[PDB]
Amino acid sequence: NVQAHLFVSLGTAPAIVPEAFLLPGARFVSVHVLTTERPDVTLIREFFRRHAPGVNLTITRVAGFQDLKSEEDHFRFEEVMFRWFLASRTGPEQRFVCLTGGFKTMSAAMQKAATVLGAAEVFHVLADDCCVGPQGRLMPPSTLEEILWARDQGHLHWIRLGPERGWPQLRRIAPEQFPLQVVEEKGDERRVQAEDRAFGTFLQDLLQRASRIAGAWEMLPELPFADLATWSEGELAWLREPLDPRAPADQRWVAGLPKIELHCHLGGFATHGELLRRVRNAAENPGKLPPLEEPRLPEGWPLPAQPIPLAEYMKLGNANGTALLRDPGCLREQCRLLYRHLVDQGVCYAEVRCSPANYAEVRSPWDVLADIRAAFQECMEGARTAPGGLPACHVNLILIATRRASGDYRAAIARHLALAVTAAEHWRDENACRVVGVDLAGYEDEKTRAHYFREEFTAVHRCGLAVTVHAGENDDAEGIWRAVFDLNARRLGHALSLGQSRELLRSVADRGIGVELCPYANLQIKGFRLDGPGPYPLLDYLREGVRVTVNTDNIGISAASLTDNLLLAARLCPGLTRLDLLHLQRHALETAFCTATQRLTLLRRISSGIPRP
Amino acid sequence: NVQAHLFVSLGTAPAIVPEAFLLPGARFVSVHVLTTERPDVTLIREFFRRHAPGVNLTITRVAGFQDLKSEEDHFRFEEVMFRWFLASRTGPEQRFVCLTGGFKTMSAAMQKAATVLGAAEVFHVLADDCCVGPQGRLMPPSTLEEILWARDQGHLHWIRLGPERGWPQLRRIAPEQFPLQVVEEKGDERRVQAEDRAFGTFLQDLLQRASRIAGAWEMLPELPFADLATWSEGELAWLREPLDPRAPADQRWVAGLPKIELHCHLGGFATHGELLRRVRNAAENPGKLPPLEEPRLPEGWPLPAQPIPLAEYMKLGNANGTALLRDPGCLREQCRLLYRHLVDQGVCYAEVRCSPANYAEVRSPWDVLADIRAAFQECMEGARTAPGGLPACHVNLILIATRRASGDYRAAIARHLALAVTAAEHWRDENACRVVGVDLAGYEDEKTRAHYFREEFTAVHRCGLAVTVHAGENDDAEGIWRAVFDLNARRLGHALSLGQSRELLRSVADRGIGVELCPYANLQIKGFRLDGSAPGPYPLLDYLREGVRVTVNTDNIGISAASLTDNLLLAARLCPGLTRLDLLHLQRHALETAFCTATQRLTLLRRISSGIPRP
RNA sequence: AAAAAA
Numbered sequence A: 001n002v003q004a005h006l007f008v009s010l011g012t013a014p015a016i017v018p019e020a021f022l023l024p025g026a027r028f029v030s031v032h033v034l035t036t037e038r039p040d041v042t043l044i045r046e047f048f049r050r051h052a053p054g055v056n057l058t059i060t061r062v063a064g065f066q067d068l069k070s071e072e073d074h075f076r077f078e079e080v081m082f083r084w085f086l087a088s089r090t091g092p093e094q095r096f097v098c099l100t101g102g103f104k105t106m107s108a109a110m111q112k113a114a115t116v117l118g119a120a121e122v123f124h125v126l127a128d129d130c131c132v133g134p135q136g137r138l139m140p141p142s143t144l145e146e147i148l149w150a151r152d153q154g155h156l157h158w159i160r161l162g163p164e165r166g167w168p169q170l171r172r173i174a175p176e177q178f179p180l181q182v183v184e185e186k187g188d189e190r191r192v193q194a195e196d197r198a199f200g201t202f203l204q205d206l207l208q209r210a211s212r213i214a215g216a217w218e219m220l221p222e223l224p225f226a227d228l229a230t231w232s233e234g235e236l237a238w239l240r241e242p243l244d245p246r247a248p249a250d251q252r253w254v255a256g257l258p259k260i261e262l263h264c265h266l267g268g269f270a271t272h273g274e275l276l277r278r279v280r281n282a283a284e285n286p287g288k289l290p291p292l293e294e295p296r297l298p299e300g301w302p303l304p305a306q307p308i309p310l311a312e313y314m315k316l317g318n319a320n321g322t323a324l325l326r327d328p329g330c331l332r333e334q335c336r337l338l339y340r341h342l343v344d345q346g347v348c349y350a351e352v353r354c355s356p357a358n359y360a361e362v363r364s365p366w367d368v369l370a371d372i373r374a375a376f377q378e379c380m381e382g383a384r385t386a387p388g389g390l391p392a393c394h395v396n397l398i399l400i401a402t403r404r405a406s407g408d409y410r411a412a413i414a415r416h417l418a419l420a421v422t423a424a425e426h427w428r429d430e431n432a433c434r435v436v437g438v439d440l441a442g443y444e445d446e447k448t449r450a451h452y453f454r455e456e457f458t459a460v461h462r463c464g465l466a467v468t469v470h471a472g473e474n475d476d477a478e479g480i481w482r483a484v485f486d487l488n489a490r491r492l493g494h495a496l497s498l499g500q501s502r503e504l505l506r507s508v509a510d511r512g513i514g515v516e517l518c519p520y521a522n523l524q525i526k527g528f529r530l531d532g533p534g535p536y537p538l539l540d541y542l543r544e545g546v547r548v549t550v551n552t553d554n555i556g557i558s559a560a561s562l563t564d565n566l567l568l569a570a571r572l573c574p575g576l577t578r579l580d581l582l583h584l585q586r587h588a589l590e591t592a593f594c595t596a597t598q599r600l601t602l603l604r605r606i607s608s609g610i611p612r613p
Numbered sequence B: 001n002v003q004a005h006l007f008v009s010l011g012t013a014p015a016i017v018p019e020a021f022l023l024p025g026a027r028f029v030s031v032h033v034l035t036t037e038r039p040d041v042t043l044i045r046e047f048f049r050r051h052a053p054g055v056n057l058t059i060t061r062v063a064g065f066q067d068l069k070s071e072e073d074h075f076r077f078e079e080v081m082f083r084w085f086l087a088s089r090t091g092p093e094q095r096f097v098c099l100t101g102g103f104k105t106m107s108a109a110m111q112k113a114a115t116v117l118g119a120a121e122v123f124h125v126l127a128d129d130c131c132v133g134p135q136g137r138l139m140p141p142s143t144l145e146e147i148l149w150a151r152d153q154g155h156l157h158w159i160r161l162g163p164e165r166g167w168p169q170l171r172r173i174a175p176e177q178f179p180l181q182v183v184e185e186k187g188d189e190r191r192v193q194a195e196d197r198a199f200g201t202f203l204q205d206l207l208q209r210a211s212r213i214a215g216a217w218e219m220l221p222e223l224p225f226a227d228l229a230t231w232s233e234g235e236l237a238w239l240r241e242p243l244d245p246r247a248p249a250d251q252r253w254v255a256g257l258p259k260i261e262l263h264c265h266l267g268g269f270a271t272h273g274e275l276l277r278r279v280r281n282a283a284e285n286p287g288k289l290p291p292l293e294e295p296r297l298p299e300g301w302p303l304p305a306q307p308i309p310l311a312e313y314m315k316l317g318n319a320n321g322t323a324l325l326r327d328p329g330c331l332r333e334q335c336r337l338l339y340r341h342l343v344d345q346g347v348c349y350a351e352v353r354c355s356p357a358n359y360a361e362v363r364s365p366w367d368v369l370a371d372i373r374a375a376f377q378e379c380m381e382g383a384r385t386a387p388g389g390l391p392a393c394h395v396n397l398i399l400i401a402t403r404r405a406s407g408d409y410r411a412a413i414a415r416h417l418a419l420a421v422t423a424a425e426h427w428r429d430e431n432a433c434r435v436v437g438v439d440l441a442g443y444e445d446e447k448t449r450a451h452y453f454r455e456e457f458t459a460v461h462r463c464g465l466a467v468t469v470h471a472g473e474n475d476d477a478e479g480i481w482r483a484v485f486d487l488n489a490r491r492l493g494h495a496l497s498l499g500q501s502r503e504l505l506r507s508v509a510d511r512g513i514g515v516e517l518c519p520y521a522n523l524q525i526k527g528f529r530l531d532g533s534a535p536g537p538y539p540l541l542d543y544l545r546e547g548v549r550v551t552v553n554t555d556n557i558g559i560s561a562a563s564l565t566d567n568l569l570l571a572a573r574l575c576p577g578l579t580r581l582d583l584l585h586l587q588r589h590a591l592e593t594a595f596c597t598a599t600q601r602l603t604l605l606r607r608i609s610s611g612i613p614r615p
Numbered sequence C: 001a002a003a004a005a006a
C-alpha cells in the first residue's frame, strides 16, 4: 500500500540506485542500498540530496568484503544480506527488491532473499547505451544530468519479475533475533557485520524440513505421528525394515524412544539384586523385615528353556511381595525407585497397577493408597522438567483385586471396587496422580462367577471409572467374550488366544479395545517359538487392527525392562518393522485411560521425541 | 564414479565454458551450454574440438529471445531453462551448474533452478585481469592459449557455493511430461522453445502449497483432515469464523462438502410432492397400492411453530412405507430415487436403515432384503465414476427393530436381529453393499427402555455386528446408560438427554460412541428454540466442545422435508457460533464412527480430505 | 551478457 521501500545492491556502477529509484509508479519513501566496501557512494548521496529531499538512505557496507577471492567472501555476504532485510521493519507488501549491481552471485543472492522472505515486486533495471562518453555508446554514468536525461528519453528499462509471497514464518521474524554488528558507521553510511551465520543455518533447516514434509505428505494417514513426516527418504525407508535386536544401533534407538507403559505391577519391581537391598535399607521397622530369602531363578531365567506354570512364577517374587511392603517406609522407597526406573527407561506415561489391600495389616487400605499416591505425586513434583513444566513421567493408578485366595470373595472384590470408586472422587485434579481404572482378574472364574461380576460391577460404570480385564490362564474365547461384552472392559491383559475366534477378533478391533501383551512374561509363563504353543500373536493382531501394546508386566520377576520388551517382540515375531514399534506406542496412547487434553499433550510430546538414526 | 555433467549459461562474452569445464577435481562430460539467439559459439566448439575430444558438447538457443526487453523475455527463458534441465537426464548427484555468464536475471534464474531442482555443485567462475589487449590487464576473452594460460598460471578462482538438496518430487519429474519443443537444429547447437508455461505453474504450485503447509503445521492436529492444511492464512481464518446459514456463499459451500450420512431411514423418504408420485408410477401391481392420501403436514412443516410428539411424527407420511412399499417395483424405485438424491447431495457414504420384514405376503423378508441390497448394488455399479473408479456413493444397510406399544412385536424384533446375523455374514464382499449393523428404534419408553432386549441381542454380539439405538429420543439419561452398557451400543441415536448426567457424557466421549443427531427432526419433535431466541439449548455445540463424537444426519428425508445440506445449514442457525471448522469435525466424527472396514475408512479419509472446496 | 545494468 503506502510507504514502498527499495532494496538495491550495487557494485562499481553508482548510477544503478538512481535508475531503480525512479521506477514508474514508484512513490518510494526510503531507499536502502547494499554495498561491498569498495565503490564510491558520493553520487548516490548527491542524487538523493538535490532532487530527493526525504528518501532516508541507508548504505550498508558489509565490512571485509573488498573482493570475491573465495566463497567465504560470498557466505559472509548472504548472512549480512538477510539480516539487512530484517533490520528494516518492512512487510512483504513494502519491499521492492532490485537485483542489479555487484557480482552475479551477489545479484543472485538478492533473488533468493526475496523469494524466501517475500517482496511486493522484484525487478531489474537496464540502460541502453546512450551517453556518448569518451568511447562511443556508454550507458549513463554521469551523475544526475544524464540519468534524468535517460528517463525522459525512453532509455531506462525496468524488467519486473512480479511479486513474491515468501514463506509464512520468514516475512516478519525480528531484527533482534539476528542483530547486525554495526562497526564504524558515519552519517547514513553503516558498515554492518555478522558475528555468526545462524540465519543461513536457520533458513536451510526450514527449507529442508519443508521439502521433506512435502515429499512425504502423501501418506500421513499411515504415519503414526506427524513428526515422522519431517524425515529423509532414507530414514523413512530405514524405518520400514525389520528390526534387528542384535544390532547395537537398533538397541540404542529403541532405548531412546518415548514409551507408554500400561501393564506394570507395583509389587514385582525389585525382587532381586541391589534394588532389593535398597528397599530393605529404607525401612521404618528394620526389626520386623523378614530375613533375606532371595529366590533362585530358573537356569537361563530371562529366556528359559522351558515355560514354568504361574504358581512357580509368582513365587519368584516372594522377597518383595507383601512381606517387605507392609512397612510404610519400604512402600515409599519402592515407589521412588520404580518412578526413577521409569524415567530412565524414557516412559512418558505409565499406569502402575497396585493392590493396597495386600499391604494392609495394621494400617487401613486407604492409608496404603494414600501413601502410594503421595509417593508418586511427590516424585512427579520433584522430577520437574520437560517443556511446559510437566512431569517427566505421568503415573496413574489402576487397582487390582487381591491375589489372596483365602477369605470371602464377594466382599474382597466389593472392597476393591468401593475403594476405587471413592478414590476416583477423592483425587480429581487432572494433572495429578489420579486413579483411572480397575482390574477385574480373579473375581470371575469361581463357580461361574460371571453373573455375580456382571451385576456387582455396575457401580464402576456408574461412577465413570475404566475397566481392564486380565485374562487368566488358558484364556478361552468365551472368557474373553464376556470380558468384552458382559462387563464392559476397555483393555484386555494378555489374551494371546484371540486369533482362534475370528468373529471376536473382528469385534475387538472394530470397538477399538486395547490388548496388553508383554513378551518376557508370556515367554516365561507360556513358552513361544523364539526366533525361527503357536506363534506369538503380536504381528498377526497388529495387521488385523487390534489395539495392541507391549508392556512389562512384572519387572523384577521377569528381570526385563520395557526397552527389552520391545526388542524381544522382534525375536518372538520375525517381521516387525521399526515403524511397527511406533504403532504400538500410538496404540498404547489411544487406549490409555488419560483424558483428551492429556492425550493430545502426550501425542505431541512423543511426536517430537523419536530419536532419528 | 559419477558422470559429472556440467550446466552453464553463455552471454555475449564466450570462453566462460572452457573456464567452467576447467573446474579442478572433476572430469566433466556432456557440457550443456545455454545461449540466447546471439552469442557466438565458434570459440567454445573449437576448444572442445582441440582440448576435450569427446566431452559431448550440446548447445541450446532459447526460442526467439535475443535482447532483454520485457518480463516476457525473461519468463520465456526461465521455462526453457527448466525443461532443458529435465531434458538432460540424471539427478542431483550429476549436475554441476555454473551461474556465470548471461544477464543478471539469467544468472539469478540459474541459481534458483539448482535450488528447487537439485544440484551436486553450484559455482561461479572469476577470471583475473591477467591478460592484455587494447586496454591492458584485461580478461582472457578469446583464444585457446589465454584460457589455458589462465589455468596453468592459476589466476582463476571458481568460488563454490556447495551442493543443494532439491525437492524430492522435483529431482526427476519426467522429460516426457514437459517436452521441450525443438526448432531448426544442426549438430551440437540447436534452438528450442517452450509451447506453454506448464512447468512454471507446476513449480509455483508446489512452493505455494509447501509454504502454506509449513506455516499451518504446529497446529495440524486441530485440523480434522490433513489435506485441509494447504489453505491460505485468510482461508484458514475464514474457516474459523462462525457459519452464516443466510449467506448464499456459505450455502453453496456446504452443498459442496463431501458428506457422510449415518442415520437415514428407507422407511420414510418421499411422502409428498412429485417424489411420491414417481414411486407409484413404477409399481408392477398398480391395482394393489392404496389410494392417494398424503397426511397434512402442520403449518410451515420444515420449521413448525409447535413441536409435535413422537407418535404423530411416525404417522406423518403414511402414504409411503409399510402400505406403499409392498410392490417389488415400488421397493426398487424407492432405493433408486434415494441413491440419486444422495449422490446429488454429495454424500460419499451412507448407511440406509430399513425394516425388510415389514414387507411380506409371499416375498419372504430375506427376499425383500436381497432385493434392497441388489437395488443399491446395481446403482453403485452404475454411478461408478467417483475418484479412482469407485462407486460415487457407497451405501450400507442397517436393519431396524421396531417396538411400538403392543402386539407380537418382539417376534418381529427376533426376526430382524436373526435376519441381520445371517445377511451380514452372507455378503462379505467388502466393496459391495452389505448389512453392517442393527438398530433399536420406534417408541422409546420407560416400559421398554434399552435393556429388556439384552437377552435378545446376545446372538448379534456373538456373531459380530454393530449395534445402534434410539436412546434419548424422548427418555432421560438413564435410557442412554442402559443402551451403552447393557446393549454395548456403538452409536446412540438422538442422544439429547445426555448433558444432564456428566459421568455418562464423559463415558460416551471416552469410549467413543457416536451420537447421531438430526437438527430438523429434533426441532420438529422437541421444538428447540431457533436463532438463540421450553426444551432447552441444543447440545450439538456442547458435545463438540466436550469431545463427544457427534454427527448431523437426516432421519426421514421426506417426512422432515429437509436434506442433509439443509440439516447442516440449520445446525449453525439453530446453534449460534457453530464454526465452519466444526462442520468438518462432524464429517470426521462420522467417518470414525461409521460401520465400515479399516481399509474403506482410509479410502474415505483421502476422498473427503481432497473433496473439501476452497471459498 | 566473469571482477560489479545490454
Ligand SMILES: Nc1ncnc2c1ncn2[C@@H]1O[C@H](COP(=O)(O)OP(=O)(O)OP(=O)(O)O)[C@@H](O)[C@H]1O
Pocket: B265, B266, B267, B268, B314, B320, B321, B322, B323, B353, B354, B355, B358, B400, B401, B402, B403, B441, B442, B443, B470, B473, B521, B555, B556
Ligand atoms: N425419527 C425417528 N425416531 C424414532 N423412531 C423412528 C423415527 N423414524 C422412524 N422411526 C421408527 O423406526 C422404524 C422405521 O420404519 P420404516 O421407515 O422402515 O418404515 P415405515 O413403514 O415408515 O414404518 P412404521 O409405519 O412402522 O413406523 C419404525 O418403527 C418407525 O416408527
